[PDB]
Amino acid sequence: SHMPASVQLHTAVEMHHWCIPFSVDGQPAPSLRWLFNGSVLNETSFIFTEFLEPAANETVRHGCLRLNQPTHVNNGNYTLLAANPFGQASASIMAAFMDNPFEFNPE
Amino acid sequence: SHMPASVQLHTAVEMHHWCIPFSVDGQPAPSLRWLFNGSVLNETSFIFTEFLEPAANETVRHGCLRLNQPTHVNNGNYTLLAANPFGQASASIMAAFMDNPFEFNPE
To answer: Glycosylation positions (chains A, B)?
Structure first.
């Protein structure tokens, strides 16, 4: 079976990739845990943590909880918990994804 | 220097991640080359090729040219060239990114 090369393109599509931005600091560096509506959030290939490369001397870390193609099922409270030998902390925000849940998705 | 854990979150932001979907077939599998407005496109961390995992028995490959945070500077023709021992092919589409080029970007 031989077949000459073929290719097809489709017009460009804007996906719906979201970022919940976060910053975490403390010394030593805190361990982290995300909660979604109060329960532990198990990271997947559509929902994961991504750090932005370390800053010059800064001890603080910056990043995103990344959500690819979130729908109403991802609505709710997202909480980042941080803990180290000297204390614990948490921050929470509410997030809703009401974009067209039926739009065509390439990935 | 000791410091208790701290954390800060910002409300969720939808980024502007785009996909130019493509499919490529041929036997043997074709080599590929992208052109942007006629010139070779050098892939970077903001502009890169991403394949969707191989299908069952299918010889054809599917994927995206991914563009993160594209602006008017990325406007133009995108051409995927494919070539193998039995032939060559190409497909081109026009793409324009006119979203707010000044919106806040987490990444």
So the answer is: 37, 42, 57, 77
Cα–Cα distance, A104 to A100 (Å, whole number) = 9
CB B64 within 8 A of CB B89: no
CB nearest B64 (choices: A67, A80, A106)? A106
Domain boundaries, chain A: 1-107
In the 8-state DSSP scheme, what is residue A37?
T
How do strand B47-52 and strand B61-68 relate by DSSP bridges?
A: antiparallel
User: Cα Rg for chain B, rounded, in angstroms?
Assistant: 19
Query: What was the structure determination method?
Result: X-ray
Do A3 and B23 lie within an 8 Å CB cutoff?
A: no
Tell which CATH architecture fits domain B1-107: Sandwich (2.60)
Resolution, angstroms, 1 dp: 2.0
Q: What are the tokens at B64?
A: 């995206």
Taking the CA of residue A78 and the nearest CA in chain B, the distance in Å comes to 9
